[PDB]
Amino acid sequence: QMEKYTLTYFNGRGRAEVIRLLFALANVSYEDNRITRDEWKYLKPRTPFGHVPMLNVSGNVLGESHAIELLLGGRFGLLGTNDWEEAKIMAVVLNIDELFQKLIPWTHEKNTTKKAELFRNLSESDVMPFLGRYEKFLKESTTGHIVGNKVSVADLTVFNMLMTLDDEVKLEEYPQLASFVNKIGQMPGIKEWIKKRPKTYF
Amino acid sequence: EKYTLTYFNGRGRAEVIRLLFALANVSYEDNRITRDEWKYLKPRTPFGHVPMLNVSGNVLGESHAIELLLGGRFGLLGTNDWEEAKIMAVVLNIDELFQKLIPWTHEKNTTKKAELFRNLSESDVMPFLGRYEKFLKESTTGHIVGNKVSVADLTVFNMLMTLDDEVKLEEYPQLASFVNKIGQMPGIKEWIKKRPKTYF
Ligand SMILES: N[C@@H](CCC(=O)N[C@@H](CS)C(=O)NCC(=O)O)C(=O)O
Ligand SMILES: N[C@@H](CCC(=O)N[C@@H](CS)C(=O)NCC(=O)O)C(=O)O
């Protein structure tokens, strides 16, 4: 008997989307529970840390996006082939989290002038360093993976962030990242999920 | 193995790693650098931060990735993948509280510092105490997760020590027993006595 997975998050990509990509890529079925703010009022105090995403695995509850990505990544064979690769994959995931956190105001700014200003102010300090970093990791990789020789949670995380930034970065100047984003995006499971998934502002 | 930990001369985000080494009784080089040396070193780290771990010439960044690696090699991530993930959830949760406490830790004037803390008390510190008091009440053995000491215990212990002047554990008997129990464990106790005395 398969574990029953239920992911709870708002109706949005946000901090849940890498988890949704892991399920998509692994072709592992789960319930994609998207709640409203109002439903969240009641649910928040019964969660372990007062946040979403949350994962329910056959009656047992786990919080924290990167802990959930750890668990699923491990079960789905997306944490490399040894404990060193696993740790390097998780380091990347945690590094992208810092960038995600810096981008929160931008993601939620619906005024286009103000949103462009938020982004401008992060361009040199965070976005350009991100692109350079991951361009270089890939340049130094022989297989076009962020860590090791197969797809991992880190690939999905960097992929997801590139999609987040798609309208604001030019990947012609980062040919490794351009190739990578097309490769991950064409993977079965991922490709159908991107077409399928609810279109949300963030 | 040859482990080198690089961080500032401080507890900060390296100290749980230092506690893991202490508890496991595993030798490592505790490399503490100055702010000035860090200017030079920063671009050759993977992400532009410390802590960093060098394991026989290979480098790993991210305090929680280092914790995950060392924790796993030392048996401090529970007994299965579910325990491990619950342990790391606690670690990641406490990291949010650490981030919120950053201005407070770095403000040295006593009245400005107290004002920083009080504005976080009901919003963040009190919820933290209630949360971890309850996790312990749910444990039969007085561990945050599972039946054995883990990285989660070391993380909650370190944060409680960080807050030791500001926090009364009068109403949190579970946490008070816990803080005592962890601090008395072989290796931890000696490390706390030996370690360099720093403001942060
Ligand atoms: N450490 C976290 C933070 C999760 C988080 O801050 N979630 C936000 C949404 S992106 C949330 O639950 N907001 C509603 C609330 O905090 O009440 C994780 O990575 O899961
Ligand atoms: N995601 C991080 C961040 C580490 C971090 O913010 N380290 C600070 C000291 S607490 C630092 O490297 N400051 C110097 C710098 O960022 O240039 C981790 O958990 O290792």
Side-chain angles (χ1 to χ4, degrees), chain A residues 9-10 15 37 40 44 50-53 64-66, chain B residues 96:
Chain A
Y9 194 71
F10 307 117
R15 290 188 179 278
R37 243 74 200 209
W40 174 238
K44 178 174 169 63
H51 296 129
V52 286
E64 289 299 304
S65 64
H66 310 310
Chain B
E96 283 190 12

Side-chain angles (χ1 to χ4, degrees), chain B residues 115-128:
Chain B
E115 187 53 19
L116 288 170
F117 188 83
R118 96 152 185 100
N119 292 141
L120 259 13
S121 178
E122 300 323 295
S123 70
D124 290 278
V125 178
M126 294 308 125
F128 155 81

Side-chain angles (χ1 to χ4, degrees), chain B residues 11-25:
Chain B
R11 290 179 311 270
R13 288 182 190 278
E15 196 62 22
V16 170
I17 291 156
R18 297 200 192 101
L19 290 167
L20 294 186
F21 278 124
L23 166 66
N25 192 211

Side-chain angles (χ1 to χ4, degrees), chain B residues 28 45 55 88 95 110 120 129 133 136 142-143 155 157 166 174 179 184-185:
Chain B
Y28 70 107
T45 65
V55 194
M88 294 305 296
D95 178 83
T110 53
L120 259 13
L129 299 171
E133 182 72 7
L136 291 167
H143 298 291
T155 303
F157 166 77
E166 310 291 340
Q174 304 304 140
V179 154
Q184 290 308 122
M185 294 183 75

Side-chain angles (χ1 to χ4, degrees), chain A residues 6-17 19-20 30-45 47 50-55 100 104 108 193 197-202:
Chain A
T6 305
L7 202 224
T8 298
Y9 194 71
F10 307 117
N11 182 23
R13 290 178 310 278
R15 290 188 179 278
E17 197 60 16
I19 291 153
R20 297 195 194 100
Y30 70 106
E31 163 173 336
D32 194 21
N33 185 36
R34 296 171 181 245
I35 81 300
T36 68
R37 243 74 200 209
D38 198 47
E39 282 170 319
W40 174 238
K41 277 189 153 152
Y42 172 81
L43 259 19
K44 178 174 169 63
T47 65
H51 296 129
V52 286
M54 293 294 313
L55 212 228
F100 179 97
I104 292 179
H108 290 289
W193 173 251
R197 70 189 174 183
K199 297 185 182 187
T200 48
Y201 193 67
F202 49 65

Side-chain angles (χ1 to χ4, degrees), chain B residues 144-187:
Chain B
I144 301 298
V145 176
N147 65 341
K148 58 167 174 153
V149 57
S150 75
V151 178
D153 303 299
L154 268 44
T155 303
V156 176
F157 166 77
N158 181 67
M159 179 53 77
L160 290 169
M161 289 197 69
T162 286
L163 301 167
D164 184 67
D165 293 335
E166 310 291 340
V167 157
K168 310 197 141 159
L169 295 181
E170 337 214 295
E171 302 317 310
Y172 299 100
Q174 304 304 140
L175 288 161
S177 174
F178 166 87
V179 154
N180 187 63
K181 179 190 155 163
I182 300 305
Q184 290 308 122
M185 294 183 75

Side-chain angles (χ1 to χ4, degrees), chain A residues 29-191:
Chain A
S29 146
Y30 70 106
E31 163 173 336
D32 194 21
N33 185 36
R34 296 171 181 245
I35 81 300
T36 68
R37 243 74 200 209
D38 198 47
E39 282 170 319
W40 174 238
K41 277 189 153 152
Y42 172 81
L43 259 19
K44 178 174 169 63
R46 304 173 164 70
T47 65
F49 313 107
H51 296 129
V52 286
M54 293 294 313
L55 212 228
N56 182 307
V57 183
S58 299
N60 298 308
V61 173
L62 202 214
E64 289 299 304
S65 64
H66 310 310
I68 297 158
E69 291 160 3
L70 178 61
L71 183 76
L72 297 178
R75 291 174 176 196
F76 298 167
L78 303 167
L79 288 177
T81 58
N82 55 233
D83 71 347
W84 186 258
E85 289 188 343
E86 172 169 339
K88 284 198 71 186
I89 283 160
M90 286 312 293
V92 166
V93 160
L94 298 158
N95 176 60
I96 302 307
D97 185 79
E98 283 179 21
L99 176 61
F100 179 97
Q101 193 170 183
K102 295 225 177 92
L103 289 166
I104 292 179
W106 170 85
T107 59
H108 290 289
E109 176 54 84
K110 297 192 186 148
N111 182 112
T112 54
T113 285
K114 284 170 200 163
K115 176 187 201 155
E117 173 70 2
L118 289 170
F119 193 87
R120 204 182 58 85
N121 288 153
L122 289 170
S123 187
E124 259 351 269
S125 62
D126 294 86
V127 177
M128 297 302 121
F130 159 79
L131 292 171
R133 179 170 287 105
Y134 288 95
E135 178 79 2
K136 194 178 190 164
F137 291 149
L138 288 164
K139 192 140 181 289
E140 289 166 2
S141 170
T142 33
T143 47
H145 299 295
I146 306 291
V147 175
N149 69 133
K150 50 177 210 164
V151 60
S152 69
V153 178
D155 298 303
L156 271 52
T157 297
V158 170
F159 172 71
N160 179 64
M161 178 60 72
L162 294 166
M163 287 201 69
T164 292
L165 305 158
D166 176 70
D167 190 53
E168 272 290 8
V169 320
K170 300 185 175 184
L171 287 181
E172 328 112 44
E173 15 199 303
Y174 305 91
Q176 300 294 145
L177 293 169
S179 178
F180 170 87
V181 89
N182 184 75
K183 193 205 196 157
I184 302 301
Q186 286 309 109
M187 294 185 83
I190 295 184
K191 187 192 184 157

